């Protein structure tokens, strides 16, 4: 025997694979990271799916490259997902 | 070429499936096809414009140009086979007897006029 | 109110000369009396002053081109070819 799937309380397996607007309650896929300057050690918040190119406010060069999905972070910079809330 | 020869080259390339590929086709994206065409055009133009017609003929007969083309184009697109299908001289410079002599080196003798 | 249904400036001919010859002449008659854009001075002030002669009211420039229009379609292509052949040298 196997556990039948409750519609009100789906298992984490099935809900994880779902599209963001196909979940039981829709929500974002994106997040913000703390990006330190590759040669400045200045931390600027960068959107995960940023499409406008982001500068380091003191470094004044590119931090990420826009793509069709998640932004491509510049080489040799530290980052960490800021908590969703 | 360097000695005033105009050559039209025709290169044909074919995509190939990868070793572990299970797809029913290996059609290439048009972006990569145009990139492959541009790289082939640049390499052939750069390699052949600074050489003479005699050296260019050697580059084409011993497949030195073809080997370098398939080596530098495979990273763009996995290629089953890259081949120079046709080479044609379309414009020649004015005739030069000394240039023809230097391209022939030691001309072998002919015995056709000689008595049998 | 609109004064004629089909013919415009051709209404001066009355019932003479036939409908098809009138229609063919109407297209050129309208264009030869119209205001054409002046590439100089950026105005719509080019008027025909004889066959092939166009004088702009705005800037008083005189241009030779076209029996009934300022620039023939053949001239537009010829202008492009000449500029293309000029850049090739």
């Amino acid at each position: 025997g196997f556990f039948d799937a409750d519609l009100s309380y789906p298992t984490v397996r099935t809900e994880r694979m779902k599209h963001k607007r196909r979940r039981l309650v829709q929500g974002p896929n994106s997040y913000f990271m703390d990006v330190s300057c590759p040669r400045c050690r200045q931390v600027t918040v960068v959107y995960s799916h940023a499409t406008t190119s982001v500068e380091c406010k003191g470094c004044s060069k590119k931090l990420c490259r826009p793509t069709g999905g998640k932004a491509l972070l510049v080489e040799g910079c530290g980052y960490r997902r800021k908590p969703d809330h | 070429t360097a000695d005033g020869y105009t050559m039209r080259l025709f290169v044909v390339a074919f995509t190939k499936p990868q070793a572990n590929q299970q797809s029913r086709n290996c059609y290439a994206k048009q972006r990569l096809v145009k990139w492959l065409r541009m790289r082939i055009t640049k390499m052939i133009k750069r390699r052949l414009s600074k050489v003479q017609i005699k050296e260019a003929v050697s580059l084409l007969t011993r497949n030195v140009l073809s080997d370098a083309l398939v080596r530098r184009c495979n990273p763009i697109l996995p290629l089953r086979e890259l081949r120079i299908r046709k080479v044609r001289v379309v414009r020649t410079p004015k005739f030069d007897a000394q240039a023809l002599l230097s391209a022939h080196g030691t001309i072998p003798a002919s015995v056709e006029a000689d008595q049998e | 109110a609109k004064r004629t249904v089909k013919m415009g400036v051709m209404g001066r001919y009355g019932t003479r000369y036939g409908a098809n010859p009138r229609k063919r002449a109407k297209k050129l008659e309208v264009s030869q009396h119209a205001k054409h854009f002046c590439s100089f001075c950026g105005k719509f002030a080019f008027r025909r002053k004889a066959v092939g002669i166009w004088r702009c009211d705005g800037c008083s420039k005189t241009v030779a081109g076209g029996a009934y229009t300022l620039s023939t379609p053949n001239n537009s292509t010829v202008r492009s070819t000449v500029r293309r052949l000029r850049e090739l040298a």
Binding site: - | - | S39, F40, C41, G42, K43
Partner: protein, 94 residues
């Protein structure tokens, strides 16, 4: 070109400008001009005279890609303009 048109729209709404050759030359004479824009169908003698004033006053000069009709449209006007002179940039960062 869209970039110059975008900044021209900003000047039209925030900065100060003058339209016409005679008024633009006046601004150049008193050194109040920040930028001069000339249409591509300006008469060659008038274009050279405005250019000489810009060189003497060290005023930046921009050659517009359209004619005086296009330049007038880009400023939100219904009339042509051969020369435009900017005396205050507003927030256009020109």
């Amino acid at each position: 070109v869209d970039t110059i048109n975008a900044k021209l729209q900003l000047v039209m709404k925030s900065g100060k400008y003058v339209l016409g050759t005679q008024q633009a030359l006046t601004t150049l004479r008193q050194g109040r001009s920040k930028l001069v824009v000339i249409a591509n169908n300006c008469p060659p003698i008038r274009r050279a005279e405005v250019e000489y004033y810009c060189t003497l006053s060290k005023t930046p000069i921009h050659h517009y890609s359209g004619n005086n009709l296009d330049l007038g449209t880009a400023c939100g006007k219904h009339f042509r303009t051969c020369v435009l002179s900017v005396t205050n940039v507003g927030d256009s960062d020109i």
